[model samples]
Target chain A: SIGEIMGKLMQGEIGDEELSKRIKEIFGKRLQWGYKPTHQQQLAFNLDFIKSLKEMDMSGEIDTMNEETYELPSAFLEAAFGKTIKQSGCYFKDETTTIDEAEEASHELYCERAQIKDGQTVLDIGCGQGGLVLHIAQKYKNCHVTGLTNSKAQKNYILMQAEKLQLSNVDVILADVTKHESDKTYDRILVIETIEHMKNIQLFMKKLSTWMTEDSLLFVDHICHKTFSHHFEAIDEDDWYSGFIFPKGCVTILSASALLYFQDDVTILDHWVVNGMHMARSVDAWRKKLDKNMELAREILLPGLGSKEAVNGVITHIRTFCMGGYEQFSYNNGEEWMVAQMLFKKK
Target chain B: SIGEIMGKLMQGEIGDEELSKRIKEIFGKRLQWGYKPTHQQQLAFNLDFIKSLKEMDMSGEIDTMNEETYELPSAFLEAAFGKTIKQSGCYFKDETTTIDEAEEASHELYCERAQIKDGQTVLDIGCGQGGLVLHIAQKYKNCHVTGLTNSKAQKNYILMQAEKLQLSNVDVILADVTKHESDKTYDRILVIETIEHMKNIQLFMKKLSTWMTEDSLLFVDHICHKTFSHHFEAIDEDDWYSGFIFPKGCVTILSASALLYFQDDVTILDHWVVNGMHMARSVDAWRKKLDKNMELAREILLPGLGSKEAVNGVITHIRTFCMGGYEQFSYNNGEEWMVAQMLFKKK
Candidate 1:
């Protein structure tokens, strides 16, 4: 019995030969490297966890055995309540209508933006959820669409939606134009809403020199701040926008003067600001949908960091940012529609 | 050296031996005599710290010697998070604006419905920040305004606001009117947005019947659903609103027929639904403000139990509810606001 063994074990094996020596012998041998006990030994070091325990009591002597030591509790930490649970996905995404509005926006972007060319290999930049790219690919059966996104989620979502739509010509891939270069040139390259995420606008344009064929065109749309240089300097003055609204993001206006800086090989067919209110209305619609899909929002705010107020707060800030202006507003493209593209003839 | 010494000290012969031996050598003797080693050990058992080892390992085995004898960490497990850190005797109630709006609404209700004399006392049920009562007290300077709410936070906020504003005659108390009886009878009483949280509307009214004078005037501004039965059924359907928005909240619209069911002492004054679009706007504004306070929201959402969608849904639903009613929406009031007061003269 455990009771019997425990009683026999503690029964005077030491017989008083330097009590510390026996104490050392019993614990040292038991806690030895070869012993490999399946549980906590005499002293454990888990500052993140132990700090919590330390606050509770001044019980038996406790000390740090190692600074690098980590301890995952025997039971799940209350701190990570919803961590593993894949909360309601479309669960909340549907409510946010992230897919619905973005799809609609993409359809409009494709129908209005992309000129159907038979046998043309088209590049779909920032193709989130792939609804637009797939629509374009389906409409123009001859066009092979290559969809790209910096986010794995966007890439995966696009691919999933593409797969469901049974559009084999539409291939969604994880690609960042900032770091990854597309060796293959396309007849028509449309980068929608992906441009603002780039820090170096001119450098990014210069870097794209290799990716275009002689007659290849590039169409890009994104919001830009009037004075990004000043925006970066004063953040909180932007309220929660600089930090919470846009993460590692920037925007700029497209002037004819600015357009003149691009390569002569690239033809700027047309450049214009999309209606800011149109985007705002779209956002309002998404907000309504997102309101319905609390599960998805909760999951995003999950890993036990659930705050409806906090999540809503972030959403509202982004909304406010979007409402601020057409040039530098948070457009669907930032997450889905940051840009509109035009044909850039590389001749 | 200390680490090495500490490691050695675990096998000391001084303590934990008799504790171990109790289950073995003299199991029956120990059981009968109740062997407790020291004052600390006795107190430890009394405090049930030994049982707290169960918290360290929710699984049975403390030393892997036994695998089936598990115990709970504490009896008051619910109290760990259930108890509020805030001080008691402080309640909070917030309105979209100061008492001015509450007073204006109250006076309008009194003049039109209650038909109370200028020199009468009225009780403001669930008086929240004493807004309506303060306004009433001023409008009917001879009339005493007594306010009550069930929240300590509300009580504190109301008292503080009242003190700051120098509403000396206004009295705010944290008391349950349903359970507590007041000696004084009022010429008029106002219940605004109070009955919505009643456990039972009829029961609440019955309790009010006993406290009323023969010629008592009553005014009420309450939230109402389409039907009483429908309001009750919604409690089970909505997790977000049911859980956090109100644990015991109920909204009722009293029809002339329904009003006759209980209160023959009362006469219908004027009951009309105000446009609640303003409430929708207020909620939107609050959400926007909360978003700015992401840290606060994050903290608030830490204990979120699938409430994100529910809150989102509620707010979205409310906005639509306002829209459907053809009311220009805001947050503070709902479109088709069932929130109105009825005046009754003591005849």
Candidate 2:
């Protein structure tokens, strides 16, 4: 009978009552007590997510690897959060830092801290999707800019955006910054939240020194915490942000004093911590954006992932990310973890 | 309103045809052709994955970070394929290397090829959850064993298993192998499918030398492809396997001759490619296991993820990984991508 019901549902032959009754009868208890489901229930839910991703329109908006792609989730985050860059968190200069403005404001803070000039050469290490690089190049036409990233997908996306913007001075290299052997030295170097991905920070810092002159200024931004326990709260078994989401990614716990002990050649010019509340605000804006697009979200993801149920799965995950982020970074009741930005001058 | 319809669906108040018709009327044309959803759809999918990991009863079966962790997807593959190690693809020793024996056969091939013997100090770099480490320690009690990994969850899991087995010879370290400092050297080193996570292979190989004696034998295994197109065929934007699944992970395309060229201090003793069909069989085993446990998977995932639909998303993701893997590695018709095992002796 259950098989017959599923068969009818597949063909759109079942009435609303029949479908609802069958789903409840088979899956109600599992929902009630948080019990694990049978294999059949799992399969029923799988189709829903596929369907949601498949049925949405994302033409020319974001660059993806191929058809059958499910990038709408992140695209939604980017749109909701108003970020072109992959980096999360922003410096809210005022109470008016709206969802869209937060991303640009964050970038603006880093750029201002670096003191970019008209004719300066800038290198952005681990430049994700090239939002910051594009911003720098577009604002200062006289500056020659280069972005280095390990992902070919990100590199190609950056190149395509550069081509569309017709920025001849922008170059995106698909290579690790540590392994990248460049004859050219940069006037300013931007490293935004990229140090967490490195296994050998000391070697990377040494590699960076080779690409900089005595006069070159470097901007390094990272997510920091005073203690390991504070960082641990943000990452747990109930989340994918740490292990799978950022795969092999780990945040560095560094103090201002520790920075001095890290490298001998670079002198710290200025260092400051960005309030974690800004990150909470930025994540809240993204969540609001997600809620706004809920209906369209279900439709787009349903066909690719399959079933209306999978769409529900997507919504839950988003809520967790946003709410968890808010809880972790909000000033009222969260960890003391905050974003730290430092300016370094080669000695 | 669409919101009313979804609210009713959440409460089990809606009937089938009415709900279906309403969904079609509100969002239909986009389903006709493949389309991308809003960012909300993306977030929804992400949490399902996290929830699945968090809620599963992995116990001693798999190693993970927390009580809410789920890592059975790959571990199921190993068990069904009969392997203690995480790396898939193996040598089907005889005609009886049926689908079930594929995994163990592959591990056997590696151990046999490396000439593993008793009383040898063995090190497994990037040792995931420590199946191989357990196997080695159990098989050769006289051999002192050590495992190096970055995951805190994995380190604890391995330690617990070692304790349960009461094998005091096993030592699992929670740190990057490159950053690992030791005055002691190993008689044999095992690097299985771990090189892809490293940004600098040259530096990693150099690091390997420090932990090895001149007479030590080194075993390195990795999934390799001759053409970029072959690797590309496996990864796409629609799926989670390539990008977020193994974030920042990159495989090396190395030839046997290239191995000789990489470090002059080591001589390539032997190298061979495992048949791609073996990997297909291994993945097939995983799919069967997932199918068998569909019910249990749902119960564990549903409550934490917030919807039966989200539970479905987890199932779909695992199925895609297994089925896609089968398609990509099957000898019937797929890329020439094969897992290569190389043995080296320090000169």
Candidate 3:
């Protein structure tokens, strides 16, 4: 476990070779391919995350993350949060709005904003675990829906869910939107909270435009910067969110940047800067749930390494996500730094 | 007269000698300074503003400005808006909160955040028309307050207002905050909506720090950028707001840059990214008031130029502030491009 080696290092009780072996065993070889610190440095990195975790006071109102590396095991998320396909942030009509109501409102608002219809072809890019896809399919049974993502695990889950639900019209594709090409144009496209991972958005937009008709609608929900230049530039370099959240991701597109790509043929129909505070409350709910289901989360995170030290490590990871994601979206003092939804039509 | 000249020019009916004399008379000679365009280009510029004014649908919802030049005639502001201090979005307890309640709440919240006391010496940097200074002086009558500004007109007006209000302890200084020297260090310094005009903020902060004791507080309110470098860079250059608004001014300071200045001696005590939507609502109120007092605003804008064409120019100018200012603060999908307040204390 990361905490074992890190704790040993902190106490000067473990040799370098043993530490490296254990570190590699715990984190595995997944983090090495992209631009990163070396495996030895990775040991120090996780150690720092643990240190930050130890220092974090979650009992009080935990607003934002202080660390640079906030990696969460996908398995734990599935076990704890379950196959809930809802996105971040709740939509509140007023201050008295409940979490469940707001979550439902968030979905309804997206559908309303995009003006989802009965017999249209809908495509959801980066369809996480196919929750949203299934939701859409179940809601609009007459509509032909396709879910696209690069995660094989997500694709499998989605396919399994579709089979269980007997959603004949719902389909899943395990491919990146940048690479996927099809002659069948969609009537409506949903790129919900997915564009942050994209590096060359202009090119992606151009490519995506080909799969759209003149009347086709492109619905985009993205995290945007107001004055800062790029996503990475907004936060500290050592921030665990940036360092470990999505290693392969490089930039978050600004609304202006997104607009620049479609200045010619596309015209914006409607847009809303989703309130960051709502996102904060949503993350708070998630954090509370994770806290309540600690045993289940630990079991899901590392089954064999569910020792005292390992559970501490898993708890730290939970804090990194719950606190870090909350802070990232909500901390700018009511200044918007979270998600925005925009609807565009090809003119 | 401007509209007449431009109208005649467009219709190929005016002579060069007469047009030049009339243009010079109506617009004055001050616009020629700096990297300005030729007479023809200047004509185009003014005509463009006029065109924008004509195109603007102010009948429905005129909440903000559209032009870069949002210079308010200080004298007019006093006559129209009165002693009423500016309101920029409010922190509300609930949706039922009234505008006045919110405005009052905004002030109270700022004071509470800064931990203002009864007998502390306070300084207001860029004390615009001494509105906030007057507000503080009235609220904390025992406190000694000094307002600093570069405008002689503002200094005179503030002094006159102080006398009218019988505020014996309120004082005014006709000097820039960066260069002004003081014998006494302040316990609290207020820098409301002023830092956008500054370029070298580090130097300004360093200089401002000298005026404060170890326990002194500094309060700053400004329009900040979320991404990008320059404040105006977010908007279109050809857009009226960027071209004419605050030509001598520069990029707004980010929270990051502000933190950088205070890293060593001064530390941030509290900060708020003033809600841009709230500010937008405030601007909307201002715009509505201006519209209600249209005749007074026109008189305050151009007393001698009361002709149909001249009044049109004044109307265009009104649009620049009411509509332009509102839009400036309100746009960008709630990504912060409006005002922010930060409180810092010397460590």
Q: Which candidate is the best by lDDT?
A: 2
The top-ranked prediction according to TM-score is: 3
Per-model interface RMSD values are 36.2, 19.7, 22.3
Worst 10 residues of 1 chain A by lDDT: A61-70
TM-score of chain B of 1: 0.52
Task: Give the per-residue lDDT of model 2 (tens digit) for A94-178.
Answer: 7776755777777788789899988899999878778889989998999999998767667777888899999988998877565
Tens digit of lDDT per residue, candidate 2, span B172-194? Answer: 87775656777778999998777
Residue A227 alpha-carbon offset, candidate 2, angstroms:
56
Q: Model 3: residues >4 Å from true position, as ranges? A: A1-75, A93-100, A233-241, A248-265, A303-315, B1-347
- Docking band of candidate 1: incorrect
Q: Rank the candidates by lDDT, best first.
A: 2, 3, 1
Interface RMSD after interface superposition, model 2 = 19.7
lDDT of 1 by residue, B22-118 (tens): 2122222322333244322332332232223223311111122111101111111111111111110111124454223333443464455556567
List DockQ for all candidates: 0.00, 0.01, 0.02
By TM-score, the better pick of 1 and 2 is: 2
